[model samples]
Target: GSSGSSGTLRNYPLTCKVVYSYKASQPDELTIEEHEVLEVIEDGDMEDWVKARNKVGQVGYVPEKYLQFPTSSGPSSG
Candidate 1:
């Protein structure tokens, strides 16, 4: 998964916390630390991965399993 620059800012993004640390092996991915807060930029088309921004002031894709979404905000529910 790869997102060049987050172009055309739109609505507010989702907030989440990292459940585990993930060292990005790909240039398109972002390195995240455990318990790090992140702003979900794009969830893409599936749950496999998503684009997010961390406190490090960087943005890139990260595995969904490594992130924990908001507890109160329920998404993907009909």
Candidate 2:
């Protein structure tokens, strides 16, 4: 089944970048690599974890704080 926004403009899933690596110990968890881009499954903010999918089709929940949402096309400045 297709996933994404159900709004008027049909916003595509927000692209997310993994800021940390997480090796899943169970099938219910997502194994993520640092710098990997993922498609967010929804827009709601979460205090703990968020749902997302990788290019390889791995879909699961990841720690919300471990992911970075891109704000612009330019590199992030410190």
Candidate 3:
């Protein structure tokens, strides 16, 4: 959706391979090949989005659909 320029790629879901459709759901369903290099940005969080490091590194927020929270065990477990 938007771009982010502040937060690091640390909080991003590293296990995912693709973004699918800029929609934070199934990584395999994404139309875009993000190379699994996207970070899930949360709204109204205690963080600040600054730059958009995509084509030219714009400044905004990551798409809500592109976000994936970490599970308990691994991969897709509780």
Candidate 4:
């Protein structure tokens, strides 16, 4: 039996779906397609912008608004 079993926990963020398409405006930016899923490197802030990786492994900052997280809200139905 192992004594004092301690493990390190990792809070890994899941992938996100792109709700809208966008073209990169600068070298530090990334182009994303509508409905495309991306691997998040860093979460975005309220201002908008997240670092993610594309299918081809291209990593860059994309507009956060375009990404749809699990808790992301959509248009409300009245």
**Which ranking of candidates, highest lDDT first?**
1, 2, 4, 3
Deviation in Å, model 4, residue 41 alpha carbon: 1.7
lDDT, residue 58, candidate 4:
82
Q: Is candidate 2 or candidate 4 better by TM-score?
A: 4
Query: In model 1, how large is the Cα lDDT of residue 61?
Result: 80
Estimate every model's Cα lDDT from 0 to 1: 0.76, 0.72, 0.37, 0.71
Q: Rank the candidates by TM-score, best first.
A: 1, 4, 2, 3
Residue-level lDDT of model 4, residues 1-78, one tens digit each, is 033422221132447899899988888888898989987756433247777779987878888776876665679997
Per-candidate TM equals: 0.67, 0.67, 0.29, 0.67
Clashing pairs in 4: none
Lowest lDDT 10-residue stretch of candidate 3: 44-53
- Stretches off by above 4 angstroms in model 1 are 1-12, 45-47, 71-78
For residue 52, give model 4's deviation from the true position in Å: 0.3
Model 4 scores what on Cα lDDT? Answer: 0.71
Writing each residue's lDDT as its tens digit, candidate 2 over 1-78 gives 365443232154667789889988867678998989887765334447666878888777788687887664787876
Per-residue lDDT of model 1, residues 1-78, tens digit only? 255644343343678888899899988889988878898877754569887877877878899876887755667868
